[PDB]
Ligand SMILES: CC(C)CC(=O)C(=O)O
Ligand SMILES: CC(C)CC(=O)C(=O)O
Ligand SMILES: [Cl-]
Ligand SMILES: [Cl-]
Ligand SMILES: [Zn+2]
């Protein structure tokens with residue numbers, strides 16, 4: 001009786017216990033600053049990491065021994081832990097869970113308020129931008145960042161502009177692979193711009209990569225920084241301007257097309273709404289419902305994106321399916 | 335380039351996007367009261383469910399259309415939705431995610447406080463008991479509740495006592511399958527006891543099933559209600575008394591053994607700490623770390639449980655592996 005109930009229960013639970021445990025351990029560890037020190041090819045030394053993160057070393061060791069028991073890290077002698085061989089895949093998968101269950105938690109917990117008075121709910125139940133950013137990065141590691149990276153590099157560009165560059169991690173990697181290429185990181189957050197400037201100095205690309213503290217919307221009035229770019233990148237940034245800033249968005253796209261060097265392209269990664277195919281539908285619906293219902297940010301279909309980009313003067317647009325469910329890469333050629 | 339990155343990304347994400355979306359939709363819907371109306375064998379009528387849950391019907395319809403796009407429900411004509419055929423398995427799997435990421439969220443977000451001043455953190459960062467209860471029920475549906483149910487029924491008992499019966503859902507189902515059997519639901523919460531009393535009246539078992547509002551600990555001093563029971567059930571309740579009430583716990587177990595009718599048994603379901611086998615280790619570590627580090631509730635190994643139950647006078651103890659990772663069923667024969 002109990003053996004039959006055992007196999008059937010194991011099949012019914014499937015991979016959910018493992019993913020549930022991985023996501024909780026990794027979100028907890030990431031908030032503590034520990035996950036950044038975990039890597040499959042090197043150890044973290046507890047005596048040093050506890051001092052660097054201002055944590056009591058015995059508490060850090062109890063956390064690392066629990067994650068070791070979980071199989072997420074390997075104890076390599078006293079006070080040294082290495083991430084398990086497939087850690088980066090586990091962290092990638094945890095990113096989806098973290099994004100839906102942690103970053104978007106204000107929407108899960110207060111839906112009744114958003115249904116009653118959206119304007120009051122939207123200003124009261126605010127997402128933690130750090131959690132949105134980290135969970136997005138983890139989802140991106142294996143499901144959208146490699147495609148955008150390889151597309152920009154294989155074009156062998158002389159000048160690359162990244163709209164919403166953050167800490168300029170993509171631009172630093174593109175310049176390291178393309179000799180003599182220059183870049184321009186555009187981002188409004190002062191915190192992200194200061195961090196980007198110190199990361200370019202470490203990479204040795206201060207002369208090659210310029211960081212500008214300004215909005216995506218300012219590119220509509222002042223497009224100078226875009227001139228002569230072979231590639232312009234815009235990762236999940238345009239839907240934040242829609243539907244309230246449609247005219248500014250269209251002037252930014254028209255300015256991107258005219259600014260491009262001959263043969264240059266604009267590469268936009270964005271989420272398309274409510275797909276029906278079996279692989280993408282579930283996560284597509286969560287992405288779409290969070291954007292449409294809770295954030296009131298307009299996601300455009302492929303057809304809409306192509307119509308808008310051709311309206312901006314782009315001669316041809318190619319849409320590519322990304323592994324990120326509901327994610328599409330649009331390459332708009334000048 | 336993008337096709338290779340597509341297949342590799344799909345393999346790296348695996349089932350995480352689908353589980354992340356299912357868990358968020360189901361937690362959101364459960365907090366709204368909607369998930370209780372979703373079942374694969376019948377429709378929910380939006381006009382009635384919106385009035386019963388005091389929700390605007392257009393907001394409920396937008397929620398149900400998003401979950402329909404997700405494949406979790408089927409629209410059966412205007413204003414009627416049915417859960418997808420495998421909904422109960424999806425909800426079961428979501429229970430693990432909900433338990434680690436939602437119910438235990440105070441521990442994820444405030445770990446640094448628990449490491450600095452546990453006593454202050456434990457009284458400040460409190461779990462939502464409703465979320466602990468619902469997520470536990472969803473995990474139990476396919477991973478521990480069927481085994482306990484079938485074990486109690488196949489014993490064909492005359493009297494069953496449930497220690498920590500809640501709304502007496504297990505006892506109502508055991509009495510419905512065993513003719514002439516009587517039951518005693520023991521639970522401290524007044525809210526759970528009132529709900530249990532109205533559920534036994536609906537089932538037509540008021541004379542057969544008695545509900546008592548009292549603690550598990552009171553059974554140590556006053557064991558009368560236990561007399562002549564063929565089966566006593568105790569689902570994940572004993573570790574809440576450890577390590578601070580070890581002597582009371584032992585007197586409750588000794589009283590269970592003496593109270594049993596000849597051939598009777600005590601059935602305890604509980605979590606064992608930090609297993610190393612590949613299937614159970616990850617979720618075992620999250621269960622164990624939340625209990626040991628954050629809640630300071632002692633989980634006992636199988637060896638410890640058997641030693642404690644034999645110390646209570648039980649002649650033989652059998653341990654059975656449950657599908658719930660780190661869950662064990664202990665049958666202690668009088
Ligand atoms: C950056 C995306 C991956 C997610 C998104 O658009 C959001 O969290 O608002
Ligand atoms: C009831 C269990 C499944 C989980 C538990 O022991 C808890 O949440 O404290
Ligand atoms: Cl032209
Ligand atoms: Cl005896
Ligand atoms: Zn967004």
Ligand SMILES: [Zn+2]
Nearest residue numbers: 570573625631
């Ligand atoms: Zn517990």
